Design an enzyme around this catalytic site. Structure first.
Site, PDB file in Angstrom:
ATOM      1  N   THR A 234       0.815  -1.197   0.000  1.00 62.29           N
ATOM      2  CA  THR A 234       0.000   0.000   0.000  1.00 62.29           C
ATOM      3  C   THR A 234       0.851   1.250   0.000  1.00 62.29           C
ATOM      4  O   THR A 234       0.608   2.155  -0.806  1.00 62.29           O
ATOM      5  CB  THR A 234      -0.892   0.010   1.238  1.00 62.29           C
ATOM      6  OG1 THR A 234      -0.077   0.208   2.398  1.00 62.29           O
ATOM      7  CG2 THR A 234      -1.541  -1.327   1.364  1.00 62.29           C
ATOM      8  N   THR A 235       1.846   1.311   0.882  1.00 68.51           N
ATOM      9  CA  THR A 235       2.894   2.306   0.728  1.00 68.51           C
ATOM     10  C   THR A 235       3.575   2.171  -0.626  1.00 68.51           C
ATOM     11  O   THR A 235       4.216   3.117  -1.097  1.00 68.51           O
ATOM     12  CB  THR A 235       3.915   2.179   1.853  1.00 68.51           C
ATOM     13  OG1 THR A 235       4.861   3.247   1.754  1.00 68.51           O
ATOM     14  CG2 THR A 235       4.651   0.872   1.735  1.00 68.51           C
TER      15      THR A 235
END
Lengths: 514, 510, 513
Positions: free
Chosen positions: A81-82
């Site tokens: 997600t990062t």
């Protein structure tokens, strides 16, 4: 207003870029944590893709849209997600050119599809079935931890992470539902983190030395007090009329010793021997003499317990929450294999540990209780997802974007379309893949260029998944490195990045609505 | 950002500039605030009242900046000040100084982790070699000198000359009553500042010193059952009716006498519960006083919470407004509970002596509050530097004869350990010169002049800067033996501490 | 002082170049268009040719100086593809900029171009074959050479006449033809018309019915110093300064007039016989009034105003030699073309000297009443003559229609530069610069410059297909089979001239004002 056609996407492309730059290191141990003032006005530090979004108050619709869609994946993984923000706008940076060259964003959204599928096909072809070894779990845990925190912080915490999940798979639970209980604790340093197979209550009630050291714990979780009140009027009964107050003065002190000696009975009912410390646990307060009358008998009574504990205690001990005391056998009051009220600072944190079927493992972190200690409260539960994902999928691969190249290689190397129309999209498609592993290296060290032509030729040499050394900037085998992409993890970004890019790539009119 | 979204004020340049620069702002004075300090700082606290010191934490907490950069590191400086009384004057400067090497390495183009990690292992290397530079250990609390010798170093690191009479006066407050083994207490030994007498009349009365007027008689017993109360007199006379005293002519008669018998019952109930001293943060009344004279229960006319607090803290008392018959829960603690005139001010005196739990109460007689509170400040942070809770503090050069050793230790070794980290490892051995500069700051010479000679003192542990001209021309004062060392620990933290936030505050581009 | 340096400084350069080239995308092939240029003369200059446009009127740029070299160079070394080169280099820069936008060194981007070109060079050496120098094989090239420079309808009507001139060679080794270009132009009723004439034509003649209308055996006496003088290769001095000198000046000049015309008429009898052959006097200057009709009625054809270029082509073409003078001399020195025919078309009298001992000189009579048309078509002839000669000089011809550019881009298949990745970009940037011509055509054609191009490559990657975008409908076809062929010397020369300037771009990171 209206930002027409090319203009509307020119907004979309931009809003992706600068944020992607933030996340080129939000990711990996190289990943740089980012802090938030204007997100609240609080002093706030966070490393993760989606949460930083929500933490900030994000006025731009793109980011505003993204925080919702990356969520669904950030729900699952928490890392990648990062990562996820990069590939998306980068793909915009790919395709916008092609439509700037001139072309339909249609055919490119079209074009991404078969590429997404070959990827999905490749995702199968790449995903390495791996075992449930805690070791194998450690490296998946720590790589997310390494992403989110220091590798040291990843290392020291990884154990308790990959531990609880074993006991939650002792339940044969395919995921992590309980044993998710995390506890921040008063300390000078966030250095201290402990793994409690059972639970931890934070209170000893108000009375010390109740036989608060408990080896045999028959857990009475009682949301009702032994403290109703010591004065005339009842706990919930309030009277400003005079004659009604003289009525309650006599039996208010009694209905305590009603419930008190029920336990005093219940002690001997459960035990008959002060030897086994019987643990009373109250969601509310308990009178001192109630504790006194209990403590002297060896009864350890806890007050002001937490509802989640009440939930946890009921479940972890095979425990029970009770609105009455009366008399019950030891097992009618669920059993904790060990209970110890533990004072750190002033507060005595009851260690209720290895509860019978310790269904909930409290992971205790002793720290400054700053957002720094909150800053390590994420990677764990994040990593928990990751190992849970690793628990979910036996199929897990090297991390560090070894898949990216091997994707970008094969997916592009062959035309999955043997067309322009889809390959055009396919071209842009698998190109936005490589953004992550190269910039990681590029942020780490060696430029995107060498590492790619390394890892490409390397994959070309290998077919082994070779991926960046994030402390070097040139590839290694991330299976050997330990940075490991769960197929559960890595798959969903292919969903998101595509599916989000689909409709947002097609807009022309934009306007204030309402 | 470019987009209306993205809440932040920190990042990129403004990180590699403003954050570190804002970090630079506050460490500026911390330089003048550590080691021998001739410098002074006016501060108005939102009393508009001036106060003068060399200490950052007193000031910085007040100071309010947009950026958590300043807002964070103080916590570490606090984290020091929490664990160690002084060096916090230093704890900020090194990080801020060591930071700005990065933004230079950023102009030199060295990566975040690259710049960070060199300091890290060198910090470990420091934490490895830092105890190797332990040049002594403390010994005996009962000894005044063994304590006072050190204590100057921190008082020095606040204020230079005063330390001599002070450090002695400190162990004369008996830091020794506590073993300093797993235990020590400020509130027991608590500073109590008597404005008046002399500042060197600042004395030691072991056992509580309360500048508050000591009323009634002396306590009924010296063991006194001590019922301390927030406002046990809200008045037993009521403020009601017309004049904010009376309305009807018939009113005044019941107002006056009602205070008496209530307070009579109140002060009787002080004797009825058995409190041998009555403490009123509420008002004093002569009847109640005479009742406290009848019942012979020593009276306290007015209280700061600090009074009530410590009374609540130390005695185990609980200060509560009683319009209510007093009930001993507070009970007693102190075995000798006195009236005394210290500074010849009426001084409420409770005393009990225990290896742990003994109040040995610093009483500062002083000519000036604005001084005696800063005089308090150094002794505070001196005895809090006495707080290590190692009776043997594994002493290292105090006032920093260390840095020259380590500035030699690391960057030499710093190159030996190779790779671009080495430069961060070599930059690591640089900001040591801060206090050698920060003293040469208030001493008035160049740190280069300092370090060149104090590299020329080579392996020493002794010679270093200070005040006067011997920090100026030679830059040589013996900071092993001027009598001045410092504990490895307070030193050990500052490196460790200023390693963290500095490393941290760089990582954050948002 | 004022110094622009490094990355931001080279932007304006690559902004100019790429910004300056994209206008030429309107050019290079029949789907592209002739670009209108105007000057301070107000002349509308219609050329799809890069060089013509480039070196006349433009916007001030630092790159404007450098680009003026290459389209000249490719015109110099070929006469074709001067429009081609320009669109490749910025396409390479646009590529190159990305990597420099990646921060990757212009030095590392520079040093990767050269192998890549060599690759394509070697590859264009591979995709070349030795073809025919045959007129029809030249038509295959002439059709193709002209269209990527000049217009197709022009190309078609030029294709036969352009080749015929360069076919008239003796097997010269010249890549362009000096004397096969003799351009006669005219105000016509056709704004564009070109007659094909082998041999030399005169600028002006003088036609009289007294003069022989048809001179079959033509002994051409081609003279600068004219009838007004007497046995002179050099003019004689005038003095109008005083009366008595001018008084004796006008009387004796007729002797200079008489002997001169006599010099021819007795010499025609000598050289051409009496009426037996026709005689040709060329007066490169005016013709005397006596001598005009006197040379006329003697069978001599005196020709007013032949150039000094007519002078030299005649001698070369007819194998004789032009004189300065009419004096009695052998017939062989006097130029002899097996026909002298003065063809008066429009108001202009064109004297053919034809059946030339060397058909080295060959002439094309351009036509138009409108000058801009007369500008276009007269300009439209030359490039092919230079271009298509590069087909008939060279046994090799490189196949055209961009089929070879898709061919190298994959033949440049990568990690072949496993070396560093800077050459891997130098090839990756270069593979895309190859395709700008296959792009710009399918661009200038329907559909996509890409969707077809990737069809082309997807096709060309298929075996047996050297396939390319049509210069017209933009559709995929095998180019070598259509005969559509750019001259061999173009590509190899083109690549060098393409890469060098783009290479020169990255080595300049500094500009000082």
């Amino acid at each position: 207003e209206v930002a027409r056609a090319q203009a509307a996407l020119a907004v979309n492309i931009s809003a992706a870029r600068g944020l992607q730059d933030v996340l080129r290191t939000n990711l990996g141990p190289k990943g740089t944590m980012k802090m938030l003032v204007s997100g609240a006005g609080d002093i706030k530090l966070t490393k993760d893709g989606n949460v930083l979004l929500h933490e900030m108050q994000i006025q731009h619709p793109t980011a505003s849209l993204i925080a919702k869609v990356a969520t669904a994946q950030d729900d699952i993984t928490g890392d990648g997600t990062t990562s996820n923000v990069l590939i998306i706008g980068e793909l915009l940076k790919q395709a916008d050119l092609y439509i700037s060259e001139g072309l339909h964003p249609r055919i490119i959204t079209e074009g991404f599809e078969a590429a997404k599928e070959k990827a999905l096909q490749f995702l199968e072809e790449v995903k390495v079935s791996r075992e449930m070894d805690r070791e194998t779990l450690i490296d998946v845990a720590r790589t997310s931890l390494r992403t989110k925190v220091h590798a040291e912080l990843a290392d020291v915490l990884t154990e308790a992470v990959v531990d609880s999940i074993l006991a939650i798979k002792k339940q044969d639970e395919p995921i992590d539902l309980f044993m998710i209980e995390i506890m921040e604790m008063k300390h000078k340093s966030e250095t201290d983190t402990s793994l409690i197979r059972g639970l931890v209550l934070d209170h000893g009630a108000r009375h010390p030395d109740m036989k608060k050291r408990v080896e045999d714990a028959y857990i009475l979780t009682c949301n009702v007090s032994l403290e109703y009140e010591k004065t005339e009027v009842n706990s919930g009964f309030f009277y400003k009329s005079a004659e009604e107050r003289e009525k309650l003065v006599k039996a208010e002190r009694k209905f305590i010793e009603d419930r008190v000696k029920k336990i005093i009975e219940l002690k001997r009912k459960v035990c008959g021997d002060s030897d086994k410390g019987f643990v009373v646990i109250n969601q509310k307060g308990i009178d001192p003499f109630s504790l006194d009358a209990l403590s002297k008998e060896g009864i350890v009574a806890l007050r002001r317990a937490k509802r989640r504990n009440m939930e946890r205690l009921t479940l972890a001990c095979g425990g029970v929450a009770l609105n009455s005391f009366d008399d019950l056998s030891p097992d009618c009051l669920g059993h904790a294999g060990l209970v110890y009220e533990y004072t750190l600072g002033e507060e005595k944190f009851t260690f209720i540990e290895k509860c019978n079927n310790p269904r909930s493992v409290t992971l205790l972190i002793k720290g400054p209780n700053k957002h720094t200690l909150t800053q390590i409260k994420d990677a764990v539960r994040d990593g928990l997802r990751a190992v849970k994902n690793a628990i979910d999928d036996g199929c897990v691969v090297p991390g560090a974007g070894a898949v990216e190249v091997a994707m970008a290689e094969a997916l592009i190397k062959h035309k999955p379309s043997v067309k322009g129309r889809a390959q055009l999209g396919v071209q842009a498609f698998a190109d936005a893949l490589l953004i992550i592993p190269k910039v990681l290296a590029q942020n780490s060290g060696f430029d995107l260029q060498e590492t790619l032509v390394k890892i490409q030729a390397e994959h070309s040499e290998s077919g082994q998944l070779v991926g960046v050394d994030l402390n070097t900037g040139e590839p290694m085998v991330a299976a050997e490195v330990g940075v490991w992409d769960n197929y559960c993890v890595k798959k969903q970004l292919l969903h998101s990045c595509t599916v989000i890019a689909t409709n947002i790539l097609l807009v022309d009119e934009i306007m204030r609505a309402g | 950002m470019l987009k209306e979204g993205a809440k932040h004020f920190s990042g990129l340049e403004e990180a590699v500039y403003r954050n570190i620069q804002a970090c630079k702002e506050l460490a500026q004075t911390t330089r003048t605030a550590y080691g021998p300090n001739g410098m002074n700082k006016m501060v108005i606290n939102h009393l508009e009242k001036l106060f003068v010191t060399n200490d950052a934490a007193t000031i910085l907490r007040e100071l309010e900046v947009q950026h958590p950069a300043a807002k964070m590191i103080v916590m570490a400086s606090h984290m020091q000040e929490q664990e160690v009384g002084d060096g916090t004057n230093f704890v900020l400067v090194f990080a801020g100084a060591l930071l700005e090497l990065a933004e230079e390495l950023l102009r030199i183009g060295l990566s975040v982790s690259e710049v960070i990690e060199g300091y890290e292992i060198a910090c470990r290397k420091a934490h490895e070699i830092l105890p190797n530079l332990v040049c002594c250990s403390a010994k005996n609390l009962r000894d005044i000198d063994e304590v006072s010798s050190l204590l100057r170093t921190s008082i020095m690191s606040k204020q230079y000359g005063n330390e001599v009479f002070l450090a002695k006066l400190i162990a004369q407050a008996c830091v020794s009553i506590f073993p300093d083994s797993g235990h020590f207490n400020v509130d027991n030994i608590r500073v109590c500042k008597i404005l008046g007498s002399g500042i060197s009349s600042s004395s030691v009365l072991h056992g509580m010193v309360f500048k508050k007027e000591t009323e009634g008689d002396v306590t009924s017993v010296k063991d006194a059952k001590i019922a301390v109360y927030s406002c046990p007199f809200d008045g037993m006379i009521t403020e009601t009716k017309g004049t904010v005293l009376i309305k009807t002519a018939e009113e005044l008669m019941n107002f006056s006498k009602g205070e008496e018998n209530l307070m009579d019952a109140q002060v009787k109930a002080i004797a009825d519960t058995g409190a041998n001293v009555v403490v009123t943060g509420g008002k004093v009344a002569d009847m109640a006083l005479h009742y406290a004279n009848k019942y012979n229960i020593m009276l306290v006319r007015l209280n700061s919470k600090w009074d009530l607090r410590r009374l609540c803290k130390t005695v185990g008392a609980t200060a509560l407004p009683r319009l209510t018959p007093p009930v001993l829960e507070e009970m007693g603690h102190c075995d000798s509970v006195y009236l005394s005139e210290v500074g010849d001010t009426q001084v409420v005196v409770f005393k009990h002596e225990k290896e742990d739990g003994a109040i040995s109460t610093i009483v500062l007689r002083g000519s000036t509050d604005n001084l005696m509170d800063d005089i308090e400040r150094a002794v505070d942070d001196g005895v809090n530097t006495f707080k290590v809770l190692t009776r043997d503090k594994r002493l290292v050069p105090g006032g920093g004869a260390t840095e020259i050793e380590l500035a030699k230790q690391i960057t030499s070794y710093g190159e030996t350990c190779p790779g671009l980290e080495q430069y961060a490892i070599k930059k690591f051995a640089e900001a040591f010169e801060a206090i050698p500069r920060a003293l040469a700051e208030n001493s008035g010479v160049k740190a280069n002049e300092v370090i060149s000679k104090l590299y020329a003192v080579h392996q020493e542990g002794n010679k270093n800067v200070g005040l006067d001209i011997e920090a100026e021309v030679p830059a040589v004062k013996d900071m092993l033996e001027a009598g001045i060392l410092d504990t490895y620990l307070g030193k050990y933290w500052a490196i460790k501490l200023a390693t963290n936030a500095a490393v941290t505050v760089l990582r954050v581009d948002q």
